[PDB]
Amino acid sequence: EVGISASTNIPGAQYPQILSGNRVLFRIKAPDAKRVQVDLGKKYDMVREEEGSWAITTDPIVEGFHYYSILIDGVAVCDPASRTFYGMSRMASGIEIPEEGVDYYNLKNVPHGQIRQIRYFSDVTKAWRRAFVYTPAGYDANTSQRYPVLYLQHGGGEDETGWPNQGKMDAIIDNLIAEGKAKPMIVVMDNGYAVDPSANSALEKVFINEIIPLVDKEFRTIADRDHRAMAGLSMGGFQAFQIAMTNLDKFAYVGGFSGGGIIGDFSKMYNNVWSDVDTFNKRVKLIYLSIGTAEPTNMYQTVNNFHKEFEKAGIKHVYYESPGTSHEWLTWRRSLNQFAELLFK
Amino acid sequence: EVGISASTNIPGAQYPQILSGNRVLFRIKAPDAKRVQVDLGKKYDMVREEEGSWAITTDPIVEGFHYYSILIDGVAVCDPASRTFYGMSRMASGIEIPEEGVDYYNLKNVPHGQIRQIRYFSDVTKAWRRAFVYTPAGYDANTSQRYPVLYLQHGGGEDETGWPNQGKMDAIIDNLIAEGKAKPMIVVMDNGYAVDPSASFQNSALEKVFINEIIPLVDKEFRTIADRDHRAMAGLSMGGFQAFQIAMTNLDKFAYVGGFSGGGIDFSKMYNNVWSDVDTFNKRVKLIYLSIGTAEPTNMYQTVNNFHKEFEKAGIKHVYYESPGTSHEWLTWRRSLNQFAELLFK
Ligand SMILES: COC(=O)/C=C/c1ccc(O)c(OC)c1
Ligand SMILES: COC(=O)/C=C/c1ccc(O)c(OC)c1
Ligand SMILES: [Cl-]
């Protein structure tokens, strides 16, 4: 009958509510609509209730974060009751379905780092750009301390606000550091779209010639490959491998979360970076690949086949299959939690 | 005709387009909708094209920032083509109509500060809160320097993301500091709501959050000059009423106060008789600033104008600014911040 308002609700909005069994109760006032649906997992038709309102209770929804839409007369729009997130190439509603007994991505009373917005003009794209830079707890007070850096990228249809919002990255990293499971580190989150209008080679040039120099001159970093990592989800995973594998002198740790390498002579990929497997293994401290067990087959296969080629070649790596999750943010929160614990050790 | 895609459009979205005369062409794919409207100043009915997109060209829209909505069958929602902003008590679409020959809120090749997110847990509300804090360009370079602080508040139906987003505050402040028109300063932007933990513009709980939590936190975590001659509070609409309520009842902590389309409502006994003695009061306060758009709804315009008149009747020194041609909308507040910041800490 009555549940708990989702944590993604706008302040003051009672609905949607999460009921027992993780069913979700949606309501909306729409007296003149012909049809009202909610698309969460599948599409559900709402039914008319009192005072022009419509409502529906869904089937159980899998735990985690989900983009969703309300459909008015078949038009997919943001639910006025929920926060929005930049995903699926627009501002989309999202809903959080809590995991029982899991709290690593939740806020805790531990020392907190700070996410900073840094603006810069790109001479590659000829546009103003923006990075978000997480500094770990104590950064401002520990002026003699220098830190390793993780460059962390969002997926297709997302932007630089993804990891701070959908990814809950500050809680994940703050909590790992506070528990002694990860080293204090700076995390840099930029935009995976870069078009050079004078012509992804453009994104690589932005990272190598603009973002890395910006972070290394504005923050107290340990500016060497043994203290520099790159990872991303989906498209950002393909970009992390493209950029790191063609700039291996700058990175010793690389991660792809539901993304990474499009596979011919696999031994020649990235300009012969791993033509000699034993030498490549000596140069890289970590290669990490993950995928949800419930991802769409085409997305699962691309990443799994990359892993399979690494296994065949003897390229050392960590491979994680996230049980019960799909091409959605819980898979990526779990991946960051695992990956960050392995970094800079 | 030739149109310019608005800067608030999602990347890749051609519409909405700004046409000559600042008319706006809106378009949405909705083949099975019964009615599609756009609410921008007033409601316009859009008209369905053969293939199921609906379109309308508005009347000329006044320059500045505007919240807007698409209505499908009377349901107000976000336009899929635009960015969203927290305003009108939800996530709402916004559109930017550029001003000819004005660039103080645009990004320039000047030294840039940073806006950072700081989290803190409030004992008053028993909830996690967050502030956005602007630090000026040489903050990390000049560790022997400390800075004055402006506490800057959003309006009703908004939140702490308002000044960084709708308000373009980092461009405004970066540019003023770079040109030598404002002193280097820290700006703290928090949330104007403080809900009682047992729940299910005067707010004693919000005052306690600022006085007992936000100000001490900022003075401890940042290199501030922690005294009233280097502490200011201002806000727009609801936040302007809050700035006056909090500053006037904690005058030993603030010497500069601003209300942008806010501050208002006998008069001589307001804020526990703070201005009983006007001559002493004028010597205690270094700046009182009030602004209003000339085109604001009458109840809002007259509220601020009447507050100004009461100051004129009492002999209370202040700056009063009318923003020409703008209403109860963000361009009024960008102009107000630009003026107020130039006056601070002098
Ligand atoms: C969970 O959300 C976040 O972490 C936000 C971080 C953030 C930091 C600085 C900004 O100027 C900003 O602008 C909206 C956002
Ligand atoms: C700047 O003034 C404001 O923001 C609002 C003023 C205001 C005035 C009269 C009212 O009856 C009212 O409530 C409907 C509000
Ligand atoms: Cl208000």
Numbering used by the authors:
A (entry chain B): 295 to 493, 508 to 571, 575 to 656
B (entry chain A): 295 to 494, 506 to 570, 576 to 656
Show the paper's wording.
Interestingly, DmCE1B in the D. mossii PUL 17 comprises two individual CE1 catalytic domains separated by a small CBM48 domain. To assess the role of each catalytic domain of the multicatalytic DmCE1B, the separate domains were also produced: DmCE1B_nt (45.3 kDa), comprising the N-terminal CE1 domain and the CBM48 domain, and DmCE1B_ct (43.3 kDa) comprising the CBM48 domain and the C-terminal CE1 domain. DmCE1B_ct forms two discrete globular domains, a ten-stranded β-sandwich domain consistent with the CBM48 family structure (residues 294–393) connected via a short linker (residues 394–404) to a three-layer αβα-sandwich (residues 405–656) typical of CE1 enzymes. Comparison to other CE1 family members enables annotation of the catalytic triad in DmCE1B_ct (Ser542, His638, Glu606), which is found in a groove between the CE1 and CBM48 domains.
To investigate potential ligand binding in DmCE1B_ct, we pursued a protein–ligand complex by soaking crystals with methyl ferulate (MFA). We determined the structure of the protein in a different crystal form, which yielded the same dimer interface observed in the apo structure, except for the addition of a partially occupied disulfide bond observed between the two Cys372 residues of each protomer along the noncrystallographic symmetry operator. This disulfide bridge was absent in the structure of the apo protein, which was crystallized at a lower pH (pH 5 versus pH 8 for the complex) but may be biologically relevant to stabilize the dimer formation. Two MFA molecules were observed and modeled: one at the interface between the two CE1 domains of the dimer, and the other close to the active site in one of the protomers. The MFA bound between the two protomers, which is far from either active site and makes minimal interactions with protein, is likely an artifact and not of biological relevance. The second MFA molecule is found on the edge of the active site groove positioned with its methyl ester ∼5 Å from the proposed catalytic center between the catalytic serine and the oxyanion hole. The MFA in DmCE1B_ct makes no direct electrostatic interactions with the protein and is not positioned in line for catalytic cleavage. This is not greatly surprising since the enzyme lacked appreciable activity on MFA. In DmCE1B_ct, the positioning of MFA further away from the catalytic center is possibly due to the smaller loop corresponding to the β-clamp or helical region.
